[PDB]
Paper text:
We present the development and characterization of prefusion-stabilized, trimeric GPCs of LASV lineages II, V, and VII, revealing structural conservation despite sequence diversity.
Building on our previous success using the I53-50A scaffold to stabilize the Josiah strain [name] ectodomain, we explored whether the same strategy could stabilize additional [name] trimers of diverse LASV lineages. To ensure stabilization of the prefusion state, we introduced the GPCysR4 mutations. Combined, these approaches enabled us to determine the structures of [name] in a reproducible manner and yielded structures of LIV, LII, LV, and LVII [name] trimers at resolutions of 3.8, 3.7, 3.7, and 3.1 Å, respectively. The [name]-I53-50A constructs recapitulate the known [name] structural features and domain organization. Our [name]-I53-50A shows high similarity, as measured by the root-mean-square deviation (RMSD) of a [name] protomer, to those previously described (0.80 Å among 300 pruned atom pairs, 2.4 Å overall fit across 341 sequence-aligned pairs with PDB: 5VK230 and 1.1 Å among 254 pruned atom pairs, 2.9 Å across 341 sequence-aligned pairs with PDB: 7PVD24; Figure S6A). In the ligand-free structures of [name]-I53-50As, the fusion peptide appears to flexibly occupy the space enclosed by the HR1a helix of the same protomer and the HR1d and HR2 loop of its adjacent protomer. In contrast, previously described structures of [name] bound to 18.5C, 37.7H, and 25.6A of the [name]-B competition group, 25.10C of the [name]-A competition group, and full-length [name] bound to matriglycan show that the fusion peptide occupies the same approximate area, yet extends inward and reaches toward the apex of the trimer near the GP1 C-terminal domain. When comparing the on-rate of IgG binding to an immobilized [name], we observed that the LIV [name]-I53-50A had the highest overall binding efficiency to the tested NAbs. [name]-I53-50A with a furin cleavage site (GPCysR4-I53-50A) was unable to bind the matriglycan array; however, LIV [name]-I53-50A featuring the native S1P cleavage site showed potent binding.
Author numbering:
A (entry chain A), B (entry chain B), C (entry chain C): 59 to 255
D (entry chain b), E (entry chain a), F (entry chain c): 260 to 424
The structure:
Amino acid sequence: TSLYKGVYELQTLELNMETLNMTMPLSCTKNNSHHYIMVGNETGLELTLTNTSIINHKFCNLSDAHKKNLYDHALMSIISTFHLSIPNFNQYEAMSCDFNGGKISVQYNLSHSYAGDAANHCGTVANGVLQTFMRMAWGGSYIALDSGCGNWDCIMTSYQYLIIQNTTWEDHCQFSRPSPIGYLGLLSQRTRDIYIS
Amino acid sequence: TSLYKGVYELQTLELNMETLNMTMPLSCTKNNSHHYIMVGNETGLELTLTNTSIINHKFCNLSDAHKKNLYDHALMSIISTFHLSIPNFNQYEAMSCDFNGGKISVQYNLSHSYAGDAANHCGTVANGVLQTFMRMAWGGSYIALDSGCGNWDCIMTSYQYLIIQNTTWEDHCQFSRPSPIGYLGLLSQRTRDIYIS
Amino acid sequence: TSLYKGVYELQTLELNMETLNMTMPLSCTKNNSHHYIMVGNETGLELTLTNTSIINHKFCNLSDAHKKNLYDHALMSIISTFHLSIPNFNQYEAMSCDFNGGKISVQYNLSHSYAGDAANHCGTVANGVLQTFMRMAWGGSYIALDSGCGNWDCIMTSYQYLIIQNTTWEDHCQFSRPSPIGYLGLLSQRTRDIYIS
Amino acid sequence: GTFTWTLSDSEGKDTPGGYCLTRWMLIEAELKCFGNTAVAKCNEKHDEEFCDMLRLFDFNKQAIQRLKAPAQMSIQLINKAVNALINDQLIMKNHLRDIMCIPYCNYSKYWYLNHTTTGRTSLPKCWLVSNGSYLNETHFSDDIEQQADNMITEMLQKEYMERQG
Amino acid sequence: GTFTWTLSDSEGKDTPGGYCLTRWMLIEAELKCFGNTAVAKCNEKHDEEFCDMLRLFDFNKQAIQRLKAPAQMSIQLINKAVNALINDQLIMKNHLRDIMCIPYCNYSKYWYLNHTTTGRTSLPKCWLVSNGSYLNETHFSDDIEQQADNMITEMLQKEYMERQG
Amino acid sequence: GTFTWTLSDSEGKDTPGGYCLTRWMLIEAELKCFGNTAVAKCNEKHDEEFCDMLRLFDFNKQAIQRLKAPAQMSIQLINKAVNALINDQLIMKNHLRDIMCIPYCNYSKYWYLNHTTTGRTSLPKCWLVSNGSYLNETHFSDDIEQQADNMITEMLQKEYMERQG
Ligand SMILES: *[C@@H]1O[C@H](CO)[C@@H](O[C@@H]2O[C@H](CO)[C@@H](O[C@@H]3O[C@H](CO[C@H]4O[C@H](CO)[C@@H](O)[C@H](O)[C@@H]4O)[C@@H](O)[C@H](O[C@H]4O[C@H](CO)[C@@H](O)[C@H](O)[C@@H]4O)[C@@H]3O)[C@H](O)[C@H]2NC(C)=O)[C@H](O)[C@H]1NC(C)=O
Ligand SMILES: *[C@@H]1O[C@H](CO)[C@@H](O[C@@H]2O[C@H](CO)[C@@H](O[C@@H]3O[C@H](CO[C@H]4O[C@H](CO)[C@@H](O)[C@H](O)[C@@H]4O)[C@@H](O)[C@H](O[C@H]4O[C@H](CO)[C@@H](O)[C@H](O)[C@@H]4O)[C@@H]3O)[C@H](O)[C@H]2NC(C)=O)[C@H](O)[C@H]1NC(C)=O
Ligand SMILES: *[C@@H]1O[C@H](CO)[C@@H](O[C@@H]2O[C@H](CO)[C@@H](O[C@@H]3O[C@H](CO[C@H]4O[C@H](CO)[C@@H](O)[C@H](O)[C@@H]4O)[C@@H](O)[C@H](O[C@H]4O[C@H](CO)[C@@H](O)[C@H](O)[C@@H]4O)[C@@H]3O)[C@H](O)[C@H]2NC(C)=O)[C@H](O)[C@H]1NC(C)=O
Ligand SMILES: *[C@@H]1O[C@H](CO)[C@@H](O[C@@H]2O[C@H](CO)[C@@H](O[C@@H]3O[C@H](CO)[C@@H](O)[C@H](O)[C@@H]3O)[C@H](O)[C@H]2NC(C)=O)[C@H](O)[C@H]1NC(C)=O
Ligand SMILES: *[C@@H]1O[C@H](CO)[C@@H](O[C@@H]2O[C@H](CO)[C@@H](O[C@@H]3O[C@H](CO)[C@@H](O)[C@H](O)[C@@H]3O)[C@H](O)[C@H]2NC(C)=O)[C@H](O)[C@H]1NC(C)=O
Ligand SMILES: *[C@@H]1O[C@H](CO[C@@H]2O[C@@H](C)[C@@H](O)[C@@H](O)[C@@H]2O)[C@@H](O[C@@H]2O[C@H](CO)[C@@H](O)[C@H](O)[C@H]2NC(C)=O)[C@H](O)[C@H]1NC(C)=O
Ligand SMILES: *[C@@H]1O[C@H](CO[C@@H]2O[C@@H](C)[C@@H](O)[C@@H](O)[C@@H]2O)[C@@H](O[C@@H]2O[C@H](CO)[C@@H](O)[C@H](O)[C@H]2NC(C)=O)[C@H](O)[C@H]1NC(C)=O
Ligand SMILES: *[C@@H]1O[C@H](CO[C@@H]2O[C@@H](C)[C@@H](O)[C@@H](O)[C@@H]2O)[C@@H](O[C@@H]2O[C@H](CO)[C@@H](O)[C@H](O)[C@H]2NC(C)=O)[C@H](O)[C@H]1NC(C)=O
Ligand SMILES: *[C@@H]1O[C@H](CO)[C@@H](O[C@@H]2O[C@H](CO)[C@@H](O)[C@H](O)[C@H]2NC(C)=O)[C@H](O)[C@H]1NC(C)=O
Ligand SMILES: *[C@@H]1O[C@H](CO)[C@@H](O[C@@H]2O[C@H](CO)[C@@H](O)[C@H](O)[C@H]2NC(C)=O)[C@H](O)[C@H]1NC(C)=O
Ligand SMILES: *[C@@H]1O[C@H](CO)[C@@H](O[C@@H]2O[C@H](CO)[C@@H](O)[C@H](O)[C@H]2NC(C)=O)[C@H](O)[C@H]1NC(C)=O
Ligand SMILES: *[C@@H]1O[C@H](CO)[C@@H](O[C@@H]2O[C@H](CO)[C@@H](O)[C@H](O)[C@H]2NC(C)=O)[C@H](O)[C@H]1NC(C)=O
Ligand SMILES: *[C@@H]1O[C@H](CO)[C@@H](O[C@@H]2O[C@H](CO)[C@@H](O)[C@H](O)[C@H]2NC(C)=O)[C@H](O)[C@H]1NC(C)=O
Ligand SMILES: *[C@@H]1O[C@H](CO)[C@@H](O[C@@H]2O[C@H](CO)[C@@H](O)[C@H](O)[C@H]2NC(C)=O)[C@H](O)[C@H]1NC(C)=O
Ligand SMILES: *[C@@H]1O[C@H](CO)[C@@H](O[C@@H]2O[C@H](CO)[C@@H](O)[C@H](O)[C@H]2NC(C)=O)[C@H](O)[C@H]1NC(C)=O
Ligand SMILES: *[C@@H]1O[C@H](CO)[C@@H](O[C@@H]2O[C@H](CO)[C@@H](O)[C@H](O)[C@H]2NC(C)=O)[C@H](O)[C@H]1NC(C)=O
Ligand SMILES: *[C@@H]1O[C@H](CO)[C@@H](O[C@@H]2O[C@H](CO)[C@@H](O)[C@H](O)[C@H]2NC(C)=O)[C@H](O)[C@H]1NC(C)=O
């Protein structure tokens, strides 16, 4: 390559973040419709954008799940980090869960990209949930939006639901290099966008 | 002016924060009894200290307002930032609201500067609400207190209510230069003074 | 002592943190079973690890205490800081209180070091409460654990209850130098380990 | 971009030796240009106060020119800008000084030294206030003299090294 | 330990002049060793980006070798490591640049200058991306040239002072 | 005020070359004065540990002398002082080192080097502990030698420039 000032060779370095799996979660993409968060070499979450309507009730039995604690605390912690990072999340009926003991089973209803709230306007529930999604899958999530860069409040997708389910570790990642940055960026939220009750 | 070391002229610079209106709110004063927070060049909040008793019920219908979302999210966000920054706010019956759809209508009852809580002692509800007020209107709010600098817990005013209402943009500001610092200082709260339930 | 490079004498300095009592709380130890947090030169909290079962009901009357405000706000603030810093505190029935007006009276039930939650496994309620305890009494708390350094999630003690009660100032501290660091470290929590409802 | 404090990657495509503050961001100033030597100093965090406003002005401009203006504030966006750009300890310290009756930064008026024959200037420092008004010039004598010595020292050291290496 | 950026107190019990990145943490690199002169720079906070990964790699290793691996992630532990080791303003700035359509750090590819006869290298800088791909080399010409001048300056100043004192 | 680390604006109205620690804040020390050259170093953030205590002592004093003592702690005030004055990464790192079985800062005992004929001293560094006790002197040999070289270097560079410019 190019020689700078007649004495320096430009050289590059690429870091392998795949060896950080034992201490921190790694986020990656696969094909837009699917993104993954892996922990260790055993399990993780599958984040999908799909027209599937898998949960058909309007409530999340969290307190019940906490009493029947049959779940991996690491996965619940990651999900909580995701949930609590959704700015201005007012539409609680849009979040439904079916833990059934140890499953994750979490569904966010963004139907028609406003989920019944008024109309598909900018700055709505879909925007709130999608911004967190885009950050959690920052390694690669840009493929999800065609126009969102020019106006951050008009992030909209066509998919009706954001589905979070637990899966096993598989070599799921492609189209990118697994990275903890999305997750780390969410942990250091600092400012929370919370409306008064 | 003065020449330093025989070679430097002291010079001054004054920044115009009035051109930051499109991206961040600007706080200013007017006549103690009134302070303002303006957004863009269209609207904002009028913060007043007055013996008016405008809301005559003891509740704030926030969940109802969130379902009937006829409000500017920017104003609700600013108000929330204010509310959640009141340290040790235990007296919930002191906060009353009447959104009536799209209005702000927020009243904080500091009557007799303790609002019925014991007596007008230092470190009470009036102090909590006023400290946040003093910071939100930091550009200029010092005119509100005659003795508070010598003992931060004895900030007291004579006015019974802190009223927050939405208004239109008008060139309201005088006695100071509009500045985002109060607001920015509140966003970076870092530590929250919250008692256990 | 040793002379470095032939010209410097190594010298030491020891700071007296006991003179910081008027503006910040100081934490110290005494005999493992007891630790203290002192404020000013008048009062403070006694933190104990004991098989005493002092509170025999499963609830904490906080809202009632807030209405009947007969308590030192400083002590309530310190306790709140402690409580809100317990990661993943799901077992609410484990926290019982009897303020009776102005007392602190706070009991955390870690019985059998899982408090009835499954079995005495790593990463449980005892671990959550003890990690906060260990930090609040960081000046000296290491005497509490024989093996915890090798695995932070397996911090366990044999004592059934963590008891927090208010006492008077006495020269309680021994085995260490009073220090605000534990408390300060808890105030700057930054990241909160909170599960979804 | 010679300024790590800015968001733009095109910041350096301007007068190589100076950064200019437009007339629009100043009060009756018309034009103020500071040497890049001084402006670049806040690439490092020095708890400088002045560059917190420059970071907000830089943000403000980028948020207007690169994005379609949303025309709805996007408070949720400024919130991230604040956490990324603002020195919180400085705001809190000025707050503490205010409430502790200690002179503090107003975030409006700044002062700098301007060399009378070279046109070289210092980075600006915040003019302090106390009890509703500005502190008198005499109370800044020590600060001004030190700033003047710092500039003299830099000029001499620069000249020394140009001659030496 | 010559590195205040590390957690280990045994960090300096290695080649006195260099810090090595194991083959295991690199992608097809086999071995990369950077001089301690450059690596030690991030003992100070310079919003460098590269050393945030080094701090995570250092943490990761210490968390594995000194503790019994819990084999259960201990997310509650990484959370403290993050707050202690990570520069949050940099992550937020790269986020803002991304959403504001400004080239930003990928946290994968880095570049550095390597002197062709001495083997001395610069601390690495993050290679920027924009719209799904990497920026072309021409857009880094200014950054590379400045880094090259910084290294030249350091070599000359070092030589100057070795001769002078 | 030559110290940007302090809250007081009258900090410099004292011995121009030194900052003194009163007998009241020390354990059986009677009097300790450190040169301003070294004390002023923590005007910049170096993750120094020692000056976090100095900032608390400075705060503590200002909070007592300028305000009517409220005599009720004002925990809500210390909370702001903490966020403005304390280096959180250092506390968290010492916490992590403790729980990771790595020697860490006790925030009590500090050491410094004292030149035997000039009386000039270094800024103090925190003495480390591990498993209930203090680390032995031999384990600090590398740190002490480096600090000694840093002081020697500074003395020589100062002398060099006094002669040169
Ligand atoms: C920083 O920015 C860059 C720019 O996008 C991102 O770049 C991606 O990097 C990842 C790896 O970290 C790339 O993933 C791999 O790309 C290979 C590209 O090979 C091409 O050419 C071969 C020729 O035979 C084709 O076969 C192939 O299809 C491509 O056309 C793929 O070959 C790799 O696939 C292999 O590995 C994956 C797992 O990693 C397996 O699932 C596959 O079966 C196969 O074994 C792989 O896809 C990605 O392509 C890069 N994209 C681009 C456009 O550069 C970085 O990810 C980003 N870093 C971060 C995290 O910010
Ligand atoms: C930093 O600290 C300083 C010190 O208080 C604060 O100073 C204030 O700065 C604001 C402007 O930013 C000043 O506001 C303006 O003051 C003018 C003063 O003029 C005087 O003399 C004329 C002579 O004819 C009189 O007419 C006038 O009444 C005054 O006696 C006013 O003239 C200005 O009024 C005009 O503009 C306002 C809108 O800005 C209009 O509403 C009016 O109708 C009129 O057109 C204006 O009031 C303020 O006076 C300053 N106070 C002092 C004591 O200095 C800074 O605000 C502060 N900065 C921050 C934000 O920290
Ligand atoms: C940093 O790390 C060090 C290492 O542990 C901690 O060290 C402790 O420091 C505290 C003081 O800050 C020590 O407390 C005092 O220790 C004295 C030790 O004296 C010994 O020798 C005499 C000989 O007659 C014996 O009588 C005595 O029992 C000891 O064997 C005690 O004498 C002191 O007791 C006196 O003061 C206390 C109150 O301080 C009174 O309650 C007593 O009645 C008596 O008057 C006192 O105990 C402690 O011993 C040190 N431990 C060790 C092993 O060094 C620092 O605390 C730590 N700093 C922090 C906060 O991180
Ligand atoms: C609200 O904020 C805007 C900044 O976003 C404030 O400033 C005004 O902004 C417009 C658009 O950039 C400027 O327009 C320009 O005018 C010059 C005139 O010579 C022209 O050459 C340019 O092509 C362009 O049209 C306008 O000058 C500027 N005005 C200023 C700084 O005075 C606006 O003033 C703020 N409004 C309120 C109520 O605070
Ligand atoms: C999950 O994380 C681990 C790191 O904790 C990843 O790397 C593998 O870690 C093991 C244990 O340290 C390495 O074992 C060593 O192999 C060498 C081979 O020459 C041997 O000499 C040593 O004595 C030791 O046995 C292993 O090499 C290393 N593999 C790498 C970096 O490729 C692991 O790959 C991660 N797994 C997943 C699914 O991501
Ligand atoms: C997922 O759905 C969206 C939105 O379509 C709605 O929901 C569907 C499940 C179905 O009930 C439709 O009748 C609803 O209208 C699909 O996106 C397209 O959106 C544009 C407007 O933005 C609309 O004009 C198109 O007709 C929609 N496409 C179709 C086939 O109707 C999206 O393509 C669906 N994705 C998948 C994988 O099915
Ligand atoms: C606002 O009210 C305060 C407090 O007065 C009380 O509330 C009034 C509405 C009325 O019901 C009074 O009878 C109540 O006592 C006024 O402040 C003064 O406070 C001092 C003690 O600090 C008291 O001795 C004075 O009598 C009060 N002033 C008056 C006229 O009673 C304050 O002035 C009122 N402000 C306005 C604009 O009306
Ligand atoms: C506090 O209790 C623990 C745990 O013992 C249980 O609770 C007691 C109050 C009593 O009801 C016991 O029968 C319960 O088993 C004591 O710790 C020991 O724990 C080990 C296992 O880790 C067990 O084998 C021992 O038998 C327990 N010790 C005794 C005497 O039973 C702890 O010692 C008690 N501490 C004090 C001060 O009483
Ligand atoms: C979530 O909790 C509700 C109760 O709060 C569960 O609904 C009850 O289910 C039982 C049968 O198991 C019925 O007899 C009750 O009449 C139901 N009550 C209500 C209000 O519907 C619900 O099944 C739980 N769901 C999940 C996914 O755990
Ligand atoms: C989500 O996690 C749970 C718990 O790890 C998985 O449930 C286990 O599945 C195996 C195989 O079917 C059973 O033998 C276990 O008894 C189940 N345990 C529990 C607590 O239910 C579940 O399969 C995972 N989800 C997915 C999609 O793999
Ligand atoms: C997800 O949310 C949408 C929007 O609220 C639900 O769609 C509504 O369904 C009812 C009953 O079929 C219709 O009367 C409404 O008109 C639909 N709303 C809109 C905007 O078309 C949808 O049922 C929810 N899905 C799940 C699985 O809960
Ligand atoms: C806040 O909500 C309460 C209900 O929770 C509203 O009060 C009810 O108003 C209807 C008439 O619209 C009456 O028939 C009910 O009897 C009232 N219930 C109670 C408990 O008072 C109240 O009006 C709402 N207020 C605002 C400002 O929105
Ligand atoms: C607070 O904001 C609301 C909404 O922007 C304002 O209400 C509007 O007022 C105009 C003029 O009276 C009506 O034509 C609109 O239909 C109203 N909209 C709604 C949603 O009610 C309200 O006037 C503002 N408050 C003040 C004091 O100006
Ligand atoms: C604001 O709060 C005050 C204080 O609680 C209320 O004043 C009380 O009113 C009742 C009924 O008139 C009296 O019996 C009490 O003695 C008053 N309290 C005191 C301390 O004098 C006031 O009504 C509230 N105002 C509004 C609009 O809610
Ligand atoms: C905590 O609050 C409960 C009520 O929510 C108190 O229990 C009541 O006590 C009265 C007598 O004072 C009885 O008549 C009621 O029947 C009790 N109700 C219930 C639900 O038990 C309880 O005593 C309070 N405890 C403390 C420590 O304050
Ligand atoms: C905890 O604090 C309360 C309030 O400061 C103490 O209660 C006081 O005790 C004295 C002596 O018995 C009584 O004269 C007071 O009337 C009590 N005040 C209240 C509000 O109850 C209590 O003693 C302290 N706890 C301990 C263990 O000392
Ligand atoms: C503290 O918690 C323990 C654990 O939940 C309680 O112990 C239980 O007591 C009941 C009734 O005696 C027994 O049937 C259970 O078997 C006990 N649990 C276990 C694990 O042995 C204890 O009573 C609670 N103490 C207080 C003061 O609330």
